[PDB]
Structure 1
Amino acid sequence: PAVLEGIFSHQIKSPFALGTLGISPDIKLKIDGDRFFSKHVAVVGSTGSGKSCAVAKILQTAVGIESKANAHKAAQKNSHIVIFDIHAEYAAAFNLEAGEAFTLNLLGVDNLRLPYWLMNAQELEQIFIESNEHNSHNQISQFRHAVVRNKCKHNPTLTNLSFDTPVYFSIDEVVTYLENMNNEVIGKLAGEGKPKLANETLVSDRDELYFDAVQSFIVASQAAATKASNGPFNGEFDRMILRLHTRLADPRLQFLFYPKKEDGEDLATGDFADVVRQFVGYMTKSNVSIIDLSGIPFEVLSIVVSLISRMIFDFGFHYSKNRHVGGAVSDVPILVVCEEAHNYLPRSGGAAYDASRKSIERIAKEGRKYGVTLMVVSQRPSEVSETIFSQCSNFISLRLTNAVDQTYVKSLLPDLSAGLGDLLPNLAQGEF
């Protein structure tokens, strides 16, 4: 035994203890950790083969928690994970006694702070505007103009602000702005080529008055004395307001349209930093963060996941590049564990899902360079996307029954090694 031990001990640097070999139970097995977690890892296993327990053992060995005794109590080391858990399964694999001095971040629907002013274009165009998927060229543009010209009011210090830029922007103001444009009536008179309010006091910059309160516009007529001609966009929008006031009053999504601080207040353009810390465990100094997605509905999960992934990626990209300016490699790595993937990453699915597949797909192509890696756990590969499981470079195969799904594993194995691909349908519980 001693020699087969040393073989793995001293040949390979940066080892990662995994478990026992099936040939002999006593021996210990180790693998290159700088390769495992540097290139995307994948677990595929049927029911009852215990994928989750294996993932938990891996993560425990990674963070040091062994034998219910945190070894790194006095000083803390670096390890950053983000688990997407649908059914609160992993929330207890890391719950040690107070003596262990372990700080864990546990987030849920009730306590998740993810506002709307941090969503890019396509996301908003999906969530707010719902009509004739692309047949709304007027409303779309005017909406964009409203948001763009409103952002500059509430954060006037910044320069060259664009639509897609993440800063505060109120939606109620925009709704009332359009509701004002609806009933506009221009007071067409000599040198009076602009709007007219009830008190006959014209207006010069719409962006100064519509945003705050509804106004009562004056009448229209062709009489030469009080010639007031109708507005350009009147009638066009009579329904968008009534369609929005509904959504904006849904309670299930109140965690995205009406965010609040611990002191019961709305976030400002300077709190952005904090909104990120948590998703990376820097607030509570918790190496691990565990999201729960059960209570969430089906219709908004697809975006709630995309947004988190995007935030993580942007942080990693910009920090890794600002570090590359000097030449050194990034030092804040992140591992994203995607559980029950087959719910929000179908192979053949409608756009109702697409908003997610893109985000994650990015990490699968060009994430390595910047400091993010993935770990997918799925029950049935042929349901998971093809791009994602085309790039992964380490497969952990537990028991699998059908033959159509075997192909993916039975391929990666070469010829002379072949012969093991037949052991799959007899694997006992816990083996790999």
Structure 2
Amino acid sequence: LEQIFIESNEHNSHNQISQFRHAVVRNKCKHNPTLTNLSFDTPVYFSIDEVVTYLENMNNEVIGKLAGEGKPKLANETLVSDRDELYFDAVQSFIVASQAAATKASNGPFNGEFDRMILRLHTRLADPRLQFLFYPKKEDGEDLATGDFADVVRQFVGYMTKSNVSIIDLSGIPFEVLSIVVSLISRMIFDFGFHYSKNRHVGGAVSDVPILVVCEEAHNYLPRSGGAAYDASRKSIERIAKEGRKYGVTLMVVSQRPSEVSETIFSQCSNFISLRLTNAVDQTYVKSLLPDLSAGLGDLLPNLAQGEFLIVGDAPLMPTVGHFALPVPEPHSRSVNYLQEWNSGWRHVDFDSVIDRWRGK
């Protein structure tokens, strides 16, 4: 949560992040009455719109500094014991503070002294690429509510008594939030294994429903050298490497630059399938990762034809060299070729239309 909504570049964090930690909580509770109270990490409903509203409202309050009359200064001087009554409906500007005996008031270090984040919040909400997080809506048209929880999982899981394949198309997602996305998805899929593998393990028996995760181009989101911003995904996935076998959720990694992948993940891998590698540092990295293969059999990698592989691990009786057949249907990517299009002639661009769509609204 901290990464999305707060950018630590500023040096006002000392009071700011603490103020946000405080702000969230009160509302986080105030929304859920049945589930009485919660904490900072607790995944139960709240609303960011009105957190923004409160942290903006704390910018215009005027509470009385009178002797024996500690009540706020409104236009009609309505008395409120708690904030809930009046911050919600509309941000309440109060009578300007002054030293006059009739309208003396107090003003503190929260009257908008951290506005600069107030600026960025509205923008993060305005970003219409990222609607799906901050304004998810159902097919009917109404927004999501706690009871809808099932759907947010089902799309990945599907049904027990049938086989499914889900394909997240991470291409469209913006680049700053991809790690948060993967972290959350992994956490969910693991927590739906914990729960469901409560009982059927009676004597250490794997569940009926096993889940396999596939991590393509891992080095994008599991870097060896990366800043805290890219560290969330490092954690959630690592957990599966540790203690997933018990609960029934496995992992698969596919990299084209192994050297730049985290050391623990590969470390907790039992079988290895190697195709042709034509760079040296990756060659040495592999030559180390697995010690079953004498140094001599490692010089086999740089000379392997198309669709020839080496398999080493517990599954087979002995390390071996094999050849795949072609897959039908084949995987293809709808990439764009440039010099094949340049050869073609000019193409009229109906600028008015593209711009109209650009307009929005």
TM range (shorter): 0.7 to 0.9
CA distance, structure 1, for counterparts of residue 180 and residue 243 of structure 2: 21
Distance 1:265 1:284 in 2: 31
Q: Deviations over 1:269-319 (max 9, x none)?
A: 111122111122239965211111111121121211111111112222233
Deviation at 1:224, TM superposition (A): 2.1
Question: Of 113, 116, 126, which aligns to 1:239?
Answer: 116
- Provide, for residues 77-101 of structure 1, a one-character-per-residue CA deviation record: whole Å limited to 9, x for no partner: xxxxxxxxxxxxxxxxxxxxxxxxx
Q: TM-score, normalised by structure 1?
A: 0.65
Does the aligned pair in 1 maintain the 2:56–2:112 contact within 8 Å? no
Counterpart of 1:296 (choices 148, 173, 178) is 173
Residues 329 and 285 of structure 1: CA distance in aligned 2, closer, same or farther (over 3 Å): closer
Partner of 1:259: helix, strand, or coil?
coil
- The answer (yes or no) to whether the contact 1:185–1:231 under 8 Å persists in 2 is no
Moved more, 341-350 or 242-251: 341-350
The question of whether the paired residues in 2 share the 8 Å contact of 1:173 and 1:212 is answered with no
- Among residues 48, 59, 66, which one is paired with 1:189 in the alignment? 66
Q: Deviations over 1:112-148 (max 9, x none)?
A: xxxxxxxxxxxx1111111347752332233233322
Pick closer, same or farther for the CA change 1:237–1:407 going to 2, 3 Å. closer
The more displaced of 250-259 and 152-161 is 152-161
Listed as ranges, the gaps of 5+ residues in structure 1 are: 1-123
Q: Secondary structure at the match of 2:166?
A: strand
User: Kindly tell me: are residues 177 and 413 of structure 1, through their superposed partners in 2, closer, same or farther at Cα, counting changes over 3 Å?
Assistant: closer
Secondary structure of the residue aligned to 2:127 is coil
Deviation at 1:326, TM superposition (A): 8.8
TM-score where L is the length of structure 2: 0.77
Matched-pair contact (CA < 8 Å) for 2:61–2:92: no
Structure 1 328/389 Cα, relative in aligned 2: closer, same or farther at 3 Å? closer
- Identity among equivalent pairs (%): 100
RCO comparison, higher one (Cα < 8 Å, 6+): 1
Alpha-carbon shift at residue 360 of structure 1 (Å): 1.2
Change in CA separation of 1:207 and 1:283 when aligned onto 2, cut-off 3 Å: farther
Are the structure 2 counterparts of residues 208 and 283 from structure 1 closer, same or farther at C-alpha, using a change threshold of 3 Å?
A: farther
Q: Deviation digits for residues 13-59 of structure 1, max 9, x if unmatched?
A: xxxxxxxxxxxxxxxxxxxxxxxxxxxxxxxxxxxxxxxxxxxxxxx
Aligned-pair distance for 1:397? 0.8
Residues 1:323 and 1:143: Cα distance change in structure 2 (over 3 Å)? farther
Distance 1:143 1:324, change over 3 A: farther
Cα 1:246–1:415, aligned 2, differ >3 Å: closer, same or farther?
closer
- CA distance in 2 between counterparts of 1:326 and 1:156 reads 41
Q: Give how far 1:398 is off.
A: 1.1
Q: Is the alpha carbon distance of 1:412 and 1:145 closer, same or farther for their aligned partners in structure 2, counting shifts above 3 Å?
A: closer
Whether the 8 Å CA contact 2:98–2:104 is kept in 1: the answer is yes
| Residues 149 and 207, structure 1, Cα contact 8 Å, conserved in 2 | no
Q: 323-332 vs 234-243, which deviates more?
A: 323-332
CA deviations over 1:376-408 (Å, ceiling 9, x no partner): 011121111111111111100111223432234
Unpaired runs of at least 5, structure 2: 309-361
Distance 1:310 1:239 in 2: 33
One of 97, 100, 122 as aligned partner of 1:220: 97
Residues 62 and 106 of structure 2 are in contact (CA less than 8 Å); yes or no, is this contact kept in structure 1? yes
1:192 offset after TM fit, Å? 2.8
Is the 1:184–1:231 Cα contact (8 Å) retained in structure 2?
no
The more displaced of 392-401 and 324-333 is 324-333
Task: Report matched runs for 1:204-215 at 5 Å.
Answer: 204-215=81-92
CA distance in 1, matches of 2:124, 2:47: 15
- Hey, what's the Cα distance between the residues in 2 that align with 1:416 and 1:220? 79
Alpha carbons of 1:367 and 1:415: their partners in 2 closer, same or farther (altered >3 Å)? closer
Please give the alpha-carbon distance, in whole angstroms, between the structure 1 residues aligned to 2:142 and 2:120.
27
Aligned-residue offset at 1:197: 1.7
Q: CA deviation at 1:190?
A: 4.3
Equivalent-residue separation in structure 2 for 1:360 and 1:202 (angstroms): 52
Cα distance between partner residues in 2 of 1:206 and 1:262: 35
Work out the CA distance in 1 between the residues paired with 2:18 and 2:61. 18
| RMSD of aligned Cα (Å) | 2.6
Which residue of the partner structure matches residue 160 of structure 2? 283
Judged with a 3 Å threshold, the aligned counterparts in structure 2 of structure 1 residues 314 and 192 are, in CA distance, closer, same or farther, namely farther
Match of 1:147 among 14, 17, 24: 24
In structure 2, the CA distance between the partners of 1:276 and 1:205, relative to structure 1 (3 Å rule), is: same
Deviations 1:193-217 (A, max 9, x none): 2422221112201133213321121
Q: Write the distance in 1 (CA, Å) between the matches of 2:199 and 2:100.
A: 66
Q: How many residues are treated as equivalent by the alignment?
A: 308
Change (3 A) 1:328 1:284: closer
Q: Does 244-253 or 405-414 show the bigger shift?
A: 405-414
Secondary structure at the aligned position of 1:395 is classed as strand
CA contact (8 A) 2:53 2:88 kept: yes
Partner Cα separation in structure 1 for residue 165 and residue 51 of structure 2: 39
1:263-274 matches, cutoff 5 A: 263-274=140-151
Kept in 1: contact 2:74–2:95 (CA 8 A):
yes
In structure 2, relative to structure 1, the CA distance for the partners of 1:213 and 1:282 (3 Å cut) is farther
- Provide the rounded CA distance (Å) in 2 between the counterparts of 1:207 and 1:297: 36
Q: Is the partner of 1:419 in helix, strand or coil?
A: helix
